Design an enzyme around this catalytic site. Structure first.
Site, PDB file in Angstrom:
ATOM      1  CG  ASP A  12      -1.910   1.018   1.310  1.00 31.42           C
ATOM      2  OD1 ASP A  12      -2.996   0.726   1.844  1.00 31.42           O
ATOM      3  OD2 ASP A  12      -1.657   2.133   0.832  1.00 31.42           O
TER       4      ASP A  12
ATOM      5  CG  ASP B 135      -4.577   0.469  -1.102  1.00 30.09           C
ATOM      6  OD1 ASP B 135      -4.930   1.112  -0.086  1.00 30.09           O
ATOM      7  OD2 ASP B 135      -4.805   0.834  -2.278  1.00 30.09           O
TER       8      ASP B 135
ATOM      9  CD  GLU C 296      -9.249   1.922  -1.044  1.00 31.62           C
ATOM     10  OE1 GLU C 296     -10.064   2.485  -1.817  1.00 31.62           O
ATOM     11  OE2 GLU C 296      -9.212   2.148   0.190  1.00 31.62           O
TER      12      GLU C 296
HETATM   13  N1  LIG Z   1      -3.705   9.732   6.254  1.00 30.79           N
HETATM   14  C1  LIG Z   1      -4.940   9.318   5.532  1.00 30.79           C
HETATM   15  C2  LIG Z   1      -4.642   7.906   5.016  1.00 30.79           C
HETATM   16  S1  LIG Z   1      -5.622   7.641   3.513  1.00 30.79           S
HETATM   17  C3  LIG Z   1      -5.688   5.814   3.535  1.00 30.79           C
HETATM   18  C4  LIG Z   1      -5.393   5.385   2.106  1.00 30.79           C
HETATM   19  S2  LIG Z   1      -5.967   3.701   1.800  1.00 30.79           S
HETATM   20  N2  LIG Z   1      -4.598   2.855   1.545  1.00 30.79           N
HETATM   21  O1  LIG Z   1      -6.708   3.605   0.597  1.00 30.79           O
HETATM   22  O2  LIG Z   1      -6.429   3.001   2.935  1.00 30.79           O
HETATM   23  C5  LIG Z   1      -6.206   9.388   6.441  1.00 30.79           C
HETATM   24  O3  LIG Z   1      -6.151  10.526   7.173  1.00 30.79           O
HETATM   25  O4  LIG Z   1      -7.116   8.595   6.505  1.00 30.79           O
HETATM   26 MN   LIG Z   2      -5.171   1.107   2.093  1.00 29.01          MN
HETATM   27 MN   LIG Z   3      -3.509   3.400   0.027  1.00 27.20          MN
END
Ligand SMILES: N[C@@H](CSCCS(N)(=O)=O)C(=O)O
Ligand SMILES: [Mn+2]
Ligand SMILES: [Mn+2]
Ligand SMILES: N[C@@H](CSCCS(N)(=O)=O)C(=O)O
Ligand SMILES: N[C@@H](CSCCS(N)(=O)=O)C(=O)O
Ligand SMILES: [Mn+2]
Ligand SMILES: [Mn+2]
Ligand SMILES: [Mn+2]
Ligand SMILES: [Mn+2]
Lengths: 314, 314, 314
Positions: B119, B227, B272
């Protein structure tokens, strides 16, 4: 040392028209001119003229066997000739089926040559294992010794003689191999580097092993059959069979750069460039240029740069 | 060995709608059919049906906690079931928050499994460190043992049990980590390879170290939570969080290829994929296909090619 | 430790207008703001104002010698000043000819600094070997000691003193070198890594050797002169001299990431960004952003992520 450009405007090796316009665009991009500027003598032999075999019936599945057998027969003759006079033969061309003729004519004058085959495909389908009959995907089959009499004789290839064995050929770039083709290469213990190997090893180590495997014992001539689709579609988008996840522009130059340094380059194949398959003028230009560039790499042109001997630029 | 496809068209893990259409496009692209053609038994369990928790108030910042807690609860149950019968569970899906359920159900039947998490993000934000509350960025937080009771209990996740520790998980692809997320991974001595490491080391050596670090002592089952945004946006453009400078199509296939060779693949997550985020039909197709392709790699499909055993193609 | 941004919107180093709009776009993209968010003290010194030398006749081939000699004279003074007060000088700018002034002013306060030159070109053409006379391709020539009095004196560069030798400079990214330029770098035994070496070695090993070669004995200050065209045209499309097959966005961040870790960064050059050469708004944005990003990498910003010390995010 001399160099000789041979155009082989041919395209019956596959269904998609356009590749015969290959050598024409490569030259239009200044392949000769540029070549001249290197430490090599250049001589343009012109484009061979092929006579179309009328009533060329498909030998079972194999299509246009006689047109291709005659086209390659003609070329092999020409390649043998310039090889004879001690010059390096450079074959610009249409499909990759013309490799049958190129490697053949070459083998005659140098029966001890080895082949480095940069391609995304193996092109080792026998008239019995193709699913399309298109000959541009069977070259290696006619040239290999082990694959001798493993398939019925074809109309027009009588003149061919399986000159090289599976221990004198090496693949680099493979990523789209048919079930049968994979069988043959695993059966005949053929040496190759699939994109996965290239990924694991790095291009540097790939070339390292390819040479110590082919020039380990005896230092023989090298025939580079370069199929432009062996680079990812991004760099050489104008071809018949694009396949993602392939060699990159840098990797392709490094491979041609190292081969140059071995000083053993005797024959070259700049196959599969099809000026009519580009979604935009850009793409075609992109493709014709890297093909050109790759060729100049084979003959000197280094990225670190070049300067003329005995000349004090200061 | 058996394989079981489990669609989890869920999308309340994040704000952007479309991901629930994920499993549908993956199948539309022939994921099953193709899978069948490998040396594995395939069985499509279909897409789980999630019941929307009405009046799902946001637990402080965490949004749709009950809908996500119930969705994951349902899945974990199903995953445990197919794991129970000795089959490999493959979860196609909407957001990455469903990993909570996937890895949980898996852990039950195999409490000694380790997790390789490809990911661009860590998704280890606790309900206390998110800045968006979106749960698809907190999965690891609920599954980790060390992060136990380090954050208030959430409406609907009661059923979860921190089953794996930080010495059984490995990251590959990281390039966009929050301040807090970085703190946690540095605090808990979690093993990972950020794009910088991948750059320094090469993908080959990355995988090498990842295995000797997770299978060094005991050879345990492997759970691959992939991911799709872990590849550069160029290859998988249709996702919620694109991030430049990531893994390449080749690298991604090599990572799934090596995991296959370990013969220890027990669970997979093709998370995703959002069919509605592509600027052009092309992009979506590009994305759905590499997702598909990555999955087939996990189960055999090699770039050097494949042939059926006991069959003499000559 | 302090940081000081110095705009040098100059462009008489080369024919193409637009580069003077460089520093303006880099700031417009939030270069300062973002910088502030790191563990460094930021202070914007503003853009130096250059007075155009009227009747600036071309010294043989060398063009606008007096305008460039005066522009660089002015800067060197300013750079020496902020270096004096113990701060890191960051020069945003127009062409790369301004490197003459940047590296000079720096050398004064730190005569033992070494130079890591990330560029596709060497820029080591002497007023006698240029074919264009454009000065942005001769900086190194004026700064090198060995190239002292190897070329006639130029109108306005009298104030310069060849402060560094060919054993304190290192090239990374070279792929388009003139014949003469290659002669000079082979003659003076200059250390470099052309795209071919980067290809053979990998970026990780490159940086490794570059440091043990420049910081092996004594740990001295480092001056990073970064020419935005050192990345492949795909990532930084808006420049004067695009050259294919160059460093990749990831590679570029890795190089700036490693230099950060050496804790020896004293001076930076974010040269050649030309907001007017982008075929689409996208391209310019793409270019200004990676430039920015590369800068932040030099001062902390890691891909694995960052968190503020002494703060327990849990
Ligand atoms: N820092 C971001 C992380 S975005 C998570 C991306 S994913 N790999 O699609 O889960 C948040 O504040 O959720
Ligand atoms: Mn993710
Ligand atoms: Mn991600
Ligand atoms: N498997 C294909 C191979 S396509 C040959 C591609 S090439 N490299 O242009 O010869 C066939 O059935 O002919
Ligand atoms: N060989 C070229 C070199 S172009 C300099 C490119 S840069 N890196 O932008 O300075 C010349 O004749 O000036
Ligand atoms: Mn071919
Ligand atoms: Mn091919
Ligand atoms: Mn430059
Ligand atoms: Mn340059």
């Amino acid at each position: 040392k001399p160099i000789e450009i041979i155009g082989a405007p041919f395209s019956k090796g596959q269904p998609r028209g356009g590749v015969e316009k290959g050598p024409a665009a490569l030259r239009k991009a200044g392949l000769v001119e540029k070549l001249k500027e290197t430490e090599y003598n250049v001589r343009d032999h012109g484009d061979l003229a092929f006579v179309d075999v009328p009533n060329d019936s498909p030998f079972q599945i194999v299509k246009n066997p006689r047109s291709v057998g005659k086209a390659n027969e003609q070329l092999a003759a020409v390649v043998a000739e310039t090889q004879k006079n001690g010059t390096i033969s450079v074959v610009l061309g249409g499909d990759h089926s013309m490799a049958i003729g190129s490697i053949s004519g070459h083998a005659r004058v140098h029966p001890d040559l080895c082949v480095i085959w940069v391609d995304a495909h193996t092109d080792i389908n026998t008239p019995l294992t193709t699913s399309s009959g298109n000959l541009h995907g069977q070259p290696v089959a006619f040239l290999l010794k082990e694959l001798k009499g493993k398939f019925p004789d074809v109309p027009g290839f009588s003149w061919v003689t399986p000159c090289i064995s599976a221990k004198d050929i090496v693949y680099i770039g493979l990523r789209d191999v048919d079930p049968g083709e994979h069988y043959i290469i695993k059966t005949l213990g053929i040496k190759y580097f699939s994109m996965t190997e290239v990924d694991k090893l790095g291009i540097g180590k790939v070339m390292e092993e390819t040479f110590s495997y082919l020039l380990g014992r005896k230092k023989r001539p090298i025939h580079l059959s370069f199929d432009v689709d062996g680079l990812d579609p991004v760099f050489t988008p104008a071809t018949g069979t694009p396949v993602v996840g392939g060699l990159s522009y840098r990797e392709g130059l490094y491979i041609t750069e190292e081969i140059y340094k071995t000083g053993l380059l005797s024959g070259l194949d700049i196959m599969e460039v099809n000026p009519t398959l580009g979604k935009t003028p850009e793409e075609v230009t992109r493709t014709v240029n890297t093909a050109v560039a790759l060729t100049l790499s084979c003959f000197g042109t280094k990225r670190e740069g070049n300067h003329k001997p005995e000349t004090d630029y200061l």
